[PDB]
Amino acid sequence: EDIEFICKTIGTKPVAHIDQFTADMLGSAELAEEVNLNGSGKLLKITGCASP
Amino acid sequence: GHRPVLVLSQNTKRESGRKVQSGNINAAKTIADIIRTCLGPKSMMKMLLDPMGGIVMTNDGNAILREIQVQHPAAKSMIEISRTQDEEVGDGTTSVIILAGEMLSVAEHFLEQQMHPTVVISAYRKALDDMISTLKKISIPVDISDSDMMLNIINSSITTKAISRWSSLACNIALDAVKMVQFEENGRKEIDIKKYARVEKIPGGIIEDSCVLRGVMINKDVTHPRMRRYIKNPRIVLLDSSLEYKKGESQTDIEITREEDFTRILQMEEEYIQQLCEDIIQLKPDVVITEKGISDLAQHYLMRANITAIRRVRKTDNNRIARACGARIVSRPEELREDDVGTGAGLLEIKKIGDEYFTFITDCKDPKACTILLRGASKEILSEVERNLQDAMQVCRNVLLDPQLVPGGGASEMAVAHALTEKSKAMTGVEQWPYRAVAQALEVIPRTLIQNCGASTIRLLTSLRAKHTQENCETWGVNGETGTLVDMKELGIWEPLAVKLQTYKTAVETAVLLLRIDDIVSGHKKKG
Amino acid sequence: GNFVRVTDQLGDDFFAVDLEAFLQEFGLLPEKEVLVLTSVRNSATCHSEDSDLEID
Amino acid sequence: PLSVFGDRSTGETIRSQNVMAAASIANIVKSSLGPVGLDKMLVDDIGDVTITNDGATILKLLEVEHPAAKVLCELADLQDKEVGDGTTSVVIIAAELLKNADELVKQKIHPTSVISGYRLACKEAVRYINENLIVNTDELGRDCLINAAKTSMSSKIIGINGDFFANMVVDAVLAIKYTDIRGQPRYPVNSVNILKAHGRSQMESMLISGYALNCVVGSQGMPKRIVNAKIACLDFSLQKTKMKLGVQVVITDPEKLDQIRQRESDITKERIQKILATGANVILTTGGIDDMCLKYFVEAGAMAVRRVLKRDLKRIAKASGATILSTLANLEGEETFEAAMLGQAEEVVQERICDDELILIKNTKARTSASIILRGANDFMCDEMERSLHDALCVVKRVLESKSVVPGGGAVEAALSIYLENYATSMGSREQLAIAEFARSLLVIPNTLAVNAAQDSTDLVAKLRAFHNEAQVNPERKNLKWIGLDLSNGKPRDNKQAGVFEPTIVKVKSLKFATEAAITILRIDDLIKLHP
Ligand SMILES: Nc1ncnc2c1ncn2[C@@H]1O[C@H](COP(=O)(O)OP(=O)(O)O)[C@@H](O)[C@H]1O
Ligand SMILES: Nc1ncnc2c1ncn2[C@@H]1O[C@H](COP(=O)(O)OP(=O)(O)O)[C@@H](O)[C@H]1O
Ligand SMILES: [Mg+2]
Ligand SMILES: [Mg+2]
């Protein structure tokens, strides 16, 4: 259920077969980093996206 | 139903204050009083009835305490202290409990007044450091190469047990077992009494016939009567893999369409067994020991080469045999090498004891493992004898690792108490009183020895204190059999420094741990 | 498991061996797993930032 | 009229109930505060015994039913997670704040005004702490870390042995130092493996210059000591090969079965042969090893350890420079093992510890690791040792990360109380009362400290307040901001000189969390308890 939101946010297009996996279906982002919340957990932030 | 508003649970019980401290101290005192009379050469044994129907007859503190189930957590802590003392050094189990009880009593004396427990704890730690220093000061070295002195040490260790009647035999058995199980490899020395030096008890016979074997004995018989039951200089091969055809890991269904495929499959099963047996035989051994099953066809093919086979041997027993006869356990028979064959066992013999067959490999040259064969009146007698032998072996290992020696019979207690009392005269603080009190609490060991001997506690203890006030009387203790003062360099009762250090450290830290508690909460769910 | 009046098929002097075998032969007792008899304790379970990391 | 299947409490009744629950939770642990506090011993329904001084452990083990009490317990847990120290202080402060706020509310002061005053007081207290009461650790040197560890370990089972344990903690923390991106040094605590073993005294606890494994060699035939170790870390089992669910073996020609069964183990034999041929001496795997592979390692004269924990294996691999391998598959489709995947250590030894054995990997190269083996009288004492040691490690990490410390012994609380009492007169009319009550409630820490020592709490707190008032009013008496409590003698003392330090983060986070919890509980004025 998160595929629509993720694709809208990043600009990626889902790939269901390796034959159609091409560079034009990737979502360019400025930074994809996993951060920790001072020992209270871990979050994965992808901040800065071409064509946001 | 009816809903009462609550913060904690209904079954949550909380108590705090002076009541908690007094309860902890009295629990420790009761635990000490349970085994107070089981200390000294004149100790009396106790019968413990197992919840499983067994009977334990012993005067060892650890067994008595472990057989008692208690509700007060302080008593649980004391029993854990007993187990820790048993596991660390293997001796002094009864002494540490009494020392902890006495220290907690003399601490309760101060807690009745307006002294905070932290002050008592700091004084106790200072006293513990001073006791360690004094014990290291009054110790004497031992010559491990001197067999007589080692036997004397083991004897003085076992004079307080039921096995003391056969003192020489027990001491020789323990010394020989510890010496031969001693090992050195890759620059790392080890003793490992737990794994090797197995004690096997066979009820019946006389205890004077008990001995330490120059090898390993197991309760096994040959797989088939045609096997040789007596081999002079056997070559032993040890295995884990079964000598029988077994299923593979993967699902391997067959599909037979031709007529001869069924008989062919059976013939190849037989051929695989024959190939395994031929691979074993290629090394030309005399005995084959396996931790798993051996097929009948495998037995036949081994007989064709005149090889005795024993199967279903425990892994620990097989490791012990490997250490004794100098063999290496091999899993795949096709990978057997010459150096894996065990040559060095000077005799293998399966003889019948009672109505059972026992396998003996008891002529090894330089064996690194042994079986202590114990024969006696019954099962409980042999269990007590095994416990005493375990104590003796632990003491021997402690002396071998640490060659320091400390006078016994309460002489060390009095010497340390006098040294601490003399040291306390130059502090002039509020901690001097608990320091002196815990110093004088060490006198509970000579007092217990005198009480168990049946002599006059007050007069003898006063005389011993007066003697220890002199200039060289650190080795003056009490004779636990006659109730008289005696010099321990003449009586000969000496103990390892490691045992005394562990006893004092454990007692002082038990007192410190139980002195830090003022609140008890119980009844809550485990939540996990 | 619906065992009632186990004394009928176990007696009054049954030991742990008898009960173990009796439960095994109906295949209700889980198989025995080999484990360390006693050792030292560690008492740790993952958590976060529990990772030594190379300096860079 | 409502016809709701449940119980309803509204107004002063529910407010007093919440305050009572919070006060009960506070009073549970108030006896375990400060160097003169004493431990508690908890017993489960199954007889398990826990002896502890940590507030978080006590509140986690306790079974709690009231929602406000649960809020306080989770507050203690959060303070433990985010800081690691000050778990009792935050609970006590939050409960006192709630009690004083309810006292204000009972005087027809609106709860919103109290909340606004509490927020203002917390913000100003944080600002005043950051601007006046912090001490930079640059001018103090290594002694600051030792003093912080000593202060943290007071009230613990290892307090008296602090002279030794503080050095151990500081060395352990400094051994795991690393710098991430941006050049900021980081101290990944919880990478210091802590092993507990009853036996010898506390003073004989060991700090390992390497790593300590709670594991033993797979087979008795392996050597127990290797000098120049070449550690190979594997993430896969070494057993007889078995095909997956999607692959099946069907035999039509009988002659192929023996070859199938032989290859079934020859695969693992070849893998182990490659691993040993690269030159490895020590093999650690998270999976199991069966007897045949154990015999291969025994014949090779190498140490093999099975069922190694994943975190332990990762720590060992990164400390020794090894790489975790979940498969021996390269980018060429082959099966190879390279010497570049081997870690190195100066020694790997299986040593005996109280009738039990553990593996020590000594002096790993390319990275320094640390492990601590705690020796105690029994299991409960070792557990309390471990908890106190973790507290000290967290405190030292906080001190090293943020280089600011604050004086202990209630000096910060007294200074904040005086400053906020002065400052309340310049803000509002009823938030003035709220800030004054915040300042008064901040004094519960020194009061509890003095009470635990059976000292005159009133007189000592009055003297401390007089000292701090003189410091704040007089301009050349700024050195009196460090005047705290000396509980041994029951007198005020310059705690900065005495070495009683705390990380600033502990105080700041405790204040913020306690204020938020108090606001959350104060926000309630009606409770509906639906029947289950
Ligand atoms: N012949 C003896 N005369 C006096 N004291 C002895 C004699 N033999 C042993 N002891 C004392 O008895 C103590 C041993 O008692 P024991 O029953 O072994 O208790 P534990 O198991 O706690 O050591 C030792 O401290 C030793 O000093
Ligand atoms: N040596 C000391 N002298 C005076 N006060 C101290 C000393 N060590 C700690 N304290 C104070 O005791 C208070 C309580 O600490 P403690 O309760 O042990 O930590 P926690 O709150 O994490 O449980 C701390 O606020 C600290 O300021
Ligand atoms: Mg003894
Ligand atoms: Mg603390």
Side-chain angles (χ1 to χ4, degrees):
Chain A
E1 46 263 20
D2 284 3
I3 300 302
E4 182 65 26
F5 189 88
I6 290 165
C7 290
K8 194 185 290 185
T9 296
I10 313 181
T12 71
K13 317 189 189 171
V15 188
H17 195 54
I18 192 77
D19 290 335
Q20 276 86 30
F21 190 93
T22 42
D24 67 338
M25 293 177 71
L26 304 185
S28 308
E30 203 65 36
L31 167 78
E33 176 197 16
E34 204 203 32
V35 300
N36 63 6
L37 318 162
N38 319 287
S40 57
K42 262 164 162 305
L43 281 176
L44 180 66
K45 290 187 190 173
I46 307 179
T47 57
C49 313
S51 88
Chain B
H2 311 281
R3 290 295 95 223
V5 172
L6 278 186
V7 175
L8 303 186
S9 298
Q10 276 279 51
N11 49 7
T12 287
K13 300 294 187 291
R14 169 166 196 253
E15 43 196 28
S16 56
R18 186 57 38 71
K19 303 301 181 66
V20 159
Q21 309 172 316
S22 293
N24 297 346
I25 287 147
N26 296 115
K29 275 163 100 177
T30 304
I31 280 284
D33 282 340
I34 283 187
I35 62 164
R36 200 166 290 284
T37 78
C38 288
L39 186 148
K42 284 195 166 174
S43 49
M44 296 288 267
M45 294 177 71
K46 302 195 160 27
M47 293 177 70
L48 276 296
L49 303 198
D50 262 355
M52 283 73 74
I55 296 174
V56 183
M57 185 180 288
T58 181
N59 48 13
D60 187 282
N62 188 31
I64 300 166
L65 288 185
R66 92 170 88 168
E67 286 304 328
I68 290 170
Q69 211 75 15
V70 291
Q71 284 288 305
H72 204 289
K76 298 188 186 272
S77 297
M78 292 293 289
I79 292 160
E80 284 307 283
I81 301 299
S82 172
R83 179 174 75 87
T84 285
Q85 171 83 10
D86 193 11
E87 279 181 29
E88 176 63 36
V89 285
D91 200 28
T93 304
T94 308
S95 304
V96 59
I97 297 292
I98 300 175
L99 278 181
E102 201 62 28
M103 293 180 183
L104 274 161
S105 300
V106 309
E108 173 196 54
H109 158 260
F110 290 103
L111 273 70
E112 294 293 328
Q113 300 158 7
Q114 300 143 293
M115 177 164 306
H116 197 262
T118 46
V119 177
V120 186
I121 285 148
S122 62
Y124 273 28
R125 295 210 148 122
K126 280 191 221 293
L128 178 57
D129 284 18
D130 287 338
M131 305 189 216
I132 292 164
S133 160
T134 304
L135 268 190
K136 279 171 181 174
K137 188 178 74 68
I138 72 159
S139 88
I140 55 149
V142 65
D143 204 31
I144 58 171
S145 68
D146 192 10
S147 179
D148 287 322
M149 185 64 72
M150 281 288 273
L151 289 178
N152 179 235
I153 291 154
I154 297 163
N155 168 75
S156 67
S157 163
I158 66 160
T159 46
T160 64
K161 291 317 193 289
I163 209 177
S164 70
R165 312 266 64 76
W166 315 272
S167 179
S168 173
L169 174 70
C171 291
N172 279 275
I173 286 172
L175 181 63
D176 294 355
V178 172
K179 282 295 275 185
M180 65 156 45
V181 179
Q182 189 168 15
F183 190 44
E184 157 66 23
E185 175 188 7
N186 267 27
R188 167 184 181 273
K189 324 188 187 297
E190 57 156 342
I191 311 292
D192 221 343
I193 306 291
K194 182 175 73 175
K195 285 182 195 318
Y196 319 109
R198 166 91 165 174
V199 165
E200 299 272 321
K201 45 177 89 73
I202 311 185
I206 76 178
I207 199 176
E208 282 91 323
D209 283 346
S210 310
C211 74
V212 58
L213 287 174
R214 196 82 175 165
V216 171
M217 183 278 288
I218 60 184
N219 182 16
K220 285 286 159 181
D221 188 21
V222 302
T223 57
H224 185 284
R226 213 203 307 163
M227 295 296 172
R228 262 181 319 162
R229 274 198 187 96
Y230 185 93
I231 309 169
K232 200 42 171 73
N233 271 302
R235 298 168 43 94
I236 305 171
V237 162
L238 316 163
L239 313 163
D240 310 332
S241 46
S242 307
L243 284 192
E244 53 194 2
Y245 199 90
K246 306 202 78 49
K247 272 168 164 66
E249 310 291 313
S250 296
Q251 40 173 323
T252 307
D253 291 331
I254 318 183
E255 292 205 348
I256 297 176
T257 304
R258 295 187 297 275
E259 313 171 59
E260 65 271 8
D261 275 7
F262 199 71
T263 80
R264 195 47 193 126
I265 287 157
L266 301 164
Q267 285 165 1
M268 317 209 298
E269 289 182 359
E270 284 193 332
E271 276 156 6
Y272 171 76
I273 290 307
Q274 173 197 56
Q275 187 52 244
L276 272 189
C277 279
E278 183 51 51
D279 270 344
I280 279 173
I281 288 157
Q282 271 315 298
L283 270 299
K284 281 196 292 181
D286 287 324
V287 194
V288 166
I289 314 285
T290 314
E291 289 182 14
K292 297 204 176 315
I294 296 175
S295 167
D296 309 344
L297 192 68
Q299 297 167 31
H300 157 84
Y301 282 118
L302 289 178
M303 277 170 204
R304 294 179 66 188
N306 201 31
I307 288 167
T308 298
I310 306 175
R311 71 189 171 187
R312 294 297 168 184
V313 178
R314 286 190 310 243
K315 183 173 288 297
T316 59
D317 274 332
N318 203 0
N319 280 327
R320 220 166 299 121
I321 297 170
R323 280 282 190 103
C325 82
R328 206 171 302 142
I329 301 100
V330 170
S331 192
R332 299 178 86 173
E334 75 256 26
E335 287 163 0
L336 269 169
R337 304 164 46 211
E338 182 52 48
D339 63 358
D340 292 336
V341 169
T343 79
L347 169 73
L348 188 153
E349 150 176 28
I350 294 94
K351 76 175 65 155
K352 203 176 162 199
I353 290 180
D355 291 315
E356 286 215 273
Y357 270 120
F358 289 93
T359 303
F360 286 77
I361 309 158
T362 61
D363 215 324
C364 312
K365 42 171 71 57
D366 196 34
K368 299 289 95 176
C370 58
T371 300
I372 295 150
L373 179 48
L374 290 191
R375 315 195 41 73
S378 78
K379 265 179 168 38
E380 289 81 353
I381 312 295
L382 286 190
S383 301
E384 168 75 2
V385 168
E386 174 201 29
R387 269 189 294 266
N388 303 157
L389 276 196
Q390 193 58 238
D391 282 342
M393 281 187 279
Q394 293 295 326
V395 161
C396 188
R397 164 166 73 185
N398 283 322
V399 176
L400 275 186
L401 294 179
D402 200 3
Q404 305 298 289
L405 206 62
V406 161
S412 60
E413 268 75 42
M414 301 300 292
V416 173
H418 168 260
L420 260 64
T421 291
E422 285 295 303
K423 194 162 304 181
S424 72
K425 291 179 176 171
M427 328 202 306
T428 62
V430 74
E431 294 194 4
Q432 54 166 317
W433 311 105
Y435 183 95
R436 222 168 299 129
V438 72
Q440 290 151 0
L442 291 178
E443 305 181 359
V444 76
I445 295 304
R447 159 147 42 84
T448 309
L449 293 160
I450 296 159
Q451 279 170 0
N452 289 349
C453 183
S456 160
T457 308
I458 175 161
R459 311 185 144 80
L460 275 194
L461 204 58
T462 314
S463 312
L464 190 49
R465 208 181 288 121
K467 197 95 183 59
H468 271 271
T469 54
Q470 298 195 21
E471 60 95 22
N472 295 116
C473 289
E474 287 93 359
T475 56
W476 271 88
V478 294
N479 196 325
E481 305 185 5
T482 72
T484 52
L485 267 68
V486 69
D487 199 345
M488 289 299 165
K489 60 182 50 176
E490 167 209 298
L491 186 53
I493 299 283
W494 298 82
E495 321 163 2
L497 170 62
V499 173
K500 297 301 290 183
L501 282 179
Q502 190 50 50
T503 300
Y504 291 6
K505 289 159 174 174
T506 318
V508 171
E509 295 194 344
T510 309
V512 159
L513 167 74
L514 282 194
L515 273 176
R516 279 205 54 98
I517 302 155
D518 56 19
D519 209 305
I520 295 179
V521 189
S522 46
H524 51 270
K525 182 67 181 294
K526 188 269 183 182
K527 198 190 294 187
Chain C
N2 198 351
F3 304 75
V4 64
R5 296 292 299 274
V6 291
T7 54
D8 306 348
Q9 61 272 17
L10 277 182
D12 299 341
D13 63 358
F14 59 98
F15 279 25
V17 297
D18 301 330
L19 187 66
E20 198 205 22
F22 178 76
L23 286 177
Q24 278 164 292
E25 61 86 20
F26 291 166
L28 309 192
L29 185 61
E31 82 294 332
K32 176 56 183 290
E33 152 77 7
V34 60
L35 73 165
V36 298
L37 188 153
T38 308
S39 198
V40 303
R41 292 183 291 113
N42 200 348
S43 159
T45 305
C46 318
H47 318 299
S48 291
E49 211 177 5
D50 55 319
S51 57
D52 208 14
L53 184 62
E54 188 66 24
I55 186 167
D56 203 10
Chain D
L2 294 174
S3 177
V4 174
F5 190 40
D7 307 289
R8 191 191 176 198
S9 307
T10 307
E12 207 166 286
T13 317
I14 191 49
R15 295 202 173 269
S16 300
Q17 190 176 306
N18 291 332
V19 166
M20 183 271 309
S24 68
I25 293 298
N27 289 321
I28 282 182
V29 301
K30 278 176 74 174
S31 72
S32 297
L33 190 76
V36 293
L38 295 175
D39 305 0
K40 303 184 206 310
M41 152 176 83
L42 301 104
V43 182
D44 290 329
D45 54 354
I46 62 170
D48 268 2
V49 176
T50 297
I51 307 170
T52 177
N53 205 14
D54 209 57
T57 311
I58 294 169
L59 295 191
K60 272 208 298 282
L61 292 166
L62 278 187
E63 175 176 11
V64 176
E65 301 183 344
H66 204 271
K70 285 164 173 295
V71 161
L72 270 194
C73 296
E74 301 158 14
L75 179 81
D77 184 37
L78 162 77
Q79 166 80 4
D80 184 26
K81 274 190 178 68
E82 286 217 356
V83 168
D85 206 32
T87 314
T88 312
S89 314
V90 61
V91 173
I92 296 176
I93 288 163
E96 196 78 9
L97 281 170
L98 185 65
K99 192 174 56 53
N100 288 168
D102 177 49
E103 193 47 52
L104 272 194
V105 168
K106 281 167 161 45
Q107 299 171 18
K108 299 313 154 191
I109 306 280
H110 200 272
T112 54
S113 292
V114 181
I115 289 170
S116 296
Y118 271 18
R119 283 273 298 152
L120 268 162
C122 187
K123 274 188 270 182
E124 261 301 315
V126 168
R127 199 204 44 89
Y128 187 83
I129 283 186
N130 285 321
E131 291 188 359
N132 284 286
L133 307 176
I134 56 151
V135 171
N136 202 228
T137 71
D138 279 340
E139 62 253 33
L140 298 183
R142 187 189 199 257
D143 287 322
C144 184
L145 321 171
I146 306 283
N147 286 332
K150 291 292 293 296
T151 302
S152 178
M153 293 189 286
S154 310
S155 71
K156 299 302 192 275
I157 193 79
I158 59 185
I160 304 298
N161 295 115
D163 301 328
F164 171 74
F165 277 107
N167 276 290
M168 215 180 59
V169 166
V170 166
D171 295 1
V173 172
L174 289 178
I176 63 174
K177 175 191 171 309
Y178 87 98
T179 74
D180 59 356
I181 48 156
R182 283 82 58 85
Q184 293 305 106
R186 301 266 299 282
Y187 299 85
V189 191
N190 309 109
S191 177
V192 175
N193 201 24
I194 290 168
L195 296 194
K196 308 178 286 294
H198 58 65
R200 318 162 162 282
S201 64
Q202 299 188 303
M203 301 278 320
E204 302 162 80
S205 304
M206 279 153 297
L207 163 70
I208 305 303
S209 190
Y211 204 81
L213 259 177
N214 193 6
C215 299
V216 293
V217 296
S219 174
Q220 288 308 305
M222 290 186 237
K224 303 292 190 295
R225 188 202 180 236
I226 287 185
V227 177
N228 278 330
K230 317 284 178 224
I231 303 107
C233 313
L234 318 175
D235 206 3
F236 53 93
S237 294
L238 292 168
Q239 298 160 329
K240 277 188 57 171
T241 307
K242 190 170 70 43
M243 320 285 261
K244 277 74 69 177
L245 277 296
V247 187
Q248 190 174 342
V249 186
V250 172
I251 294 299
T252 47
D253 193 6
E255 308 281 318
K256 305 292 178 67
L257 185 61
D258 51 0
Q259 293 270 79
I260 293 295
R261 295 156 64 84
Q262 183 79 7
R263 273 308 291 186
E264 206 166 9
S265 62
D266 277 10
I267 291 167
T268 318
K269 165 186 102 78
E270 287 153 5
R271 284 208 204 104
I272 292 146
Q273 276 185 337
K274 283 166 194 155
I275 291 177
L276 291 165
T278 199
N281 287 117
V282 188
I283 297 89
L284 316 171
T285 175
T286 49
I289 308 174
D290 59 341
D291 297 340
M292 173 193 47
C293 313
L294 288 177
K295 303 303 182 293
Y296 281 120
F297 288 122
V298 160
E299 295 293 334
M303 293 177 70
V305 188
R306 53 177 166 197
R307 298 296 167 198
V308 181
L309 284 193
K310 193 43 191 304
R311 51 157 174 86
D312 284 350
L313 191 59
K314 282 204 290 180
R315 288 172 199 160
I316 290 155
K318 188 176 288 293
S320 50
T323 62
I324 305 292
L325 284 192
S326 49
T327 187
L328 305 190
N330 51 2
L331 298 193
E332 276 73 17
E334 285 303 324
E335 200 83 21
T336 60
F337 191 99
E338 293 99 8
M341 313 272 153
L342 288 184
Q344 298 192 21
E346 208 203 359
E347 213 182 344
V348 169
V349 176
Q350 169 161 320
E351 270 192 15
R352 179 156 171 275
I353 299 286
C354 187
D355 206 3
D356 276 314
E357 299 192 75
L358 61 84
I359 283 166
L360 294 169
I361 302 147
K362 290 183 168 177
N363 190 27
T364 64
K365 87 174 296 184
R367 186 76 172 87
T368 50
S369 194
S371 295
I372 290 173
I373 308 177
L374 294 168
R375 311 307 303 276
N378 50 7
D379 295 344
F380 320 135
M381 180 184 175
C382 291
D383 289 321
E384 184 39 46
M385 282 176 107
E386 176 202 57
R387 282 177 222 115
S388 307
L389 183 63
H390 187 249
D391 268 19
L393 292 158
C394 292
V395 159
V396 172
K397 165 198 188 164
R398 301 305 166 185
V399 166
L400 272 164
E401 281 187 350
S402 82
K403 317 175 96 66
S404 70
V405 292
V406 290
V412 166
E413 282 83 354
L416 277 188
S417 81
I418 288 289
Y419 168 71
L420 289 171
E421 188 193 21
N422 272 2
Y423 162 80
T425 67
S426 63
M427 295 296 172
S429 181
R430 290 170 186 254
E431 49 197 4
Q432 183 178 2
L433 292 179
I435 297 160
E437 280 308 277
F438 194 102
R440 215 170 52 73
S441 44
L442 283 182
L443 286 168
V444 69
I445 291 303
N447 271 123
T448 308
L449 295 187
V451 159
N452 284 348
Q455 300 295 301
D456 197 1
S457 170
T458 305
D459 215 359
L460 290 176
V461 164
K463 278 175 191 131
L464 210 53
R465 276 180 55 89
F467 267 123
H468 279 272
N469 184 25
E470 188 67 29
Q472 295 204 19
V473 166
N474 186 282
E476 77 269 17
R477 296 314 279 283
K478 309 273 178 226
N479 58 347
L480 292 166
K481 308 169 322 193
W482 325 119
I483 297 284
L485 282 198
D486 172 33
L487 277 296
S488 307
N489 310 289
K491 298 179 70 62
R493 184 188 52 186
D494 191 278
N495 279 357
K496 176 186 176 311
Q497 193 191 350
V500 189
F501 301 136
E502 293 181 352
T504 317
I505 179 167
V506 187
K507 284 282 140 66
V508 165
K509 294 287 191 78
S510 60
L511 274 182
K512 293 182 168 172
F513 296 157
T515 310
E516 205 166 16
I519 282 170
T520 301
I521 305 294
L522 202 66
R523 198 76 203 194
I524 314 158
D525 77 331
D526 192 30
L527 167 81
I528 295 93
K529 206 167 173 292
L530 288 192
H531 191 274

